[PDB]
A and B are shown apart, each in its own frame.
Chain A
Amino acid sequence: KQPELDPDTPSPIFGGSTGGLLRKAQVEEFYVITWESPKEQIFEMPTGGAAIMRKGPNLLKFARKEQCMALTTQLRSKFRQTPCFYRVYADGKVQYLHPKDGVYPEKVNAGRVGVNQNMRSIGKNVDPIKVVKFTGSEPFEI
């Protein structure tokens, strides 16, 4: 069960910085991350300095998506902690992205069907002949 975003979640103790949180975050979108973080500890922020983190699930949020994938990968690095992602649009609609499979896209989950791929040797593509349409960047099969 992919968990959905929950407002009114406490935040880690930190002073402030000058990264992100601009006009884009108010009228376009903002991204959210949540993760366990037991054993209240010290961590580093991708757009700031060092901060403390209580035990129990805690939630953060930033401006760009990579600003949270960096934290997910960090959490991989040291102690096995398992955060998640969230999307937000102007209408308030929320979308869950990472990890949809729940098993961290680097590992397969029981079964799905992927797109944007073709069974052809590297190269051996089509010459610019018969490619006058050019459809932006061709999938070569659609």
Chain B
Amino acid sequence: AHVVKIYDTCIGCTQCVRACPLDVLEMVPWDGCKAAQMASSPRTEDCVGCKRCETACPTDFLSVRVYLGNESTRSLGLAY
């Protein structure tokens, strides 16, 4: 599906998860300053590739980049 990656450039703002419309990525241990979280993509069978998580990520440069791959029923948002 959509190969999603998360680089070390991250602050753990918890925003790319309260913005993702498909609840695809999680945030489990990271050693930060005040919040100490890092994003991760444990599952991708439901990720559509809307690039809504890349808009809210304030990291420069972005912490997450969706490598566009192949399409499916979930990836094409098909109710039929």
Contacts and interface: CB of A to CB of B under 8 A. Distances in A.
Interface of A: 19-20, 22-25, 28, 63-66, 69-70, 72, 85, 97-99, 101, 105-109, 111-123, 136-140
B6 A120 contact: no
B79 A24 contact: yes
Nearest to A24: B80
Contacts of A98: 23
Contact of B27 (A107, A121, A139): A107
Given A64-B77, A66-B22, A106-B14, A111 B8 contact: no
Contacts, number: 110
Contacts of A114: 26, 28, 38-42
Given A64-B77, A116-B40, A117-B39, 17 more contacts: A22-B79, A22-B80, A65-B23, A69-B22, A107-B27, A109-B28, A113-B28, A114-B39, A116-B3, A118-B5, A119-B7, A120-B7, A122-B7, A122-B60, A136-B70, A139-B5, A140-B5
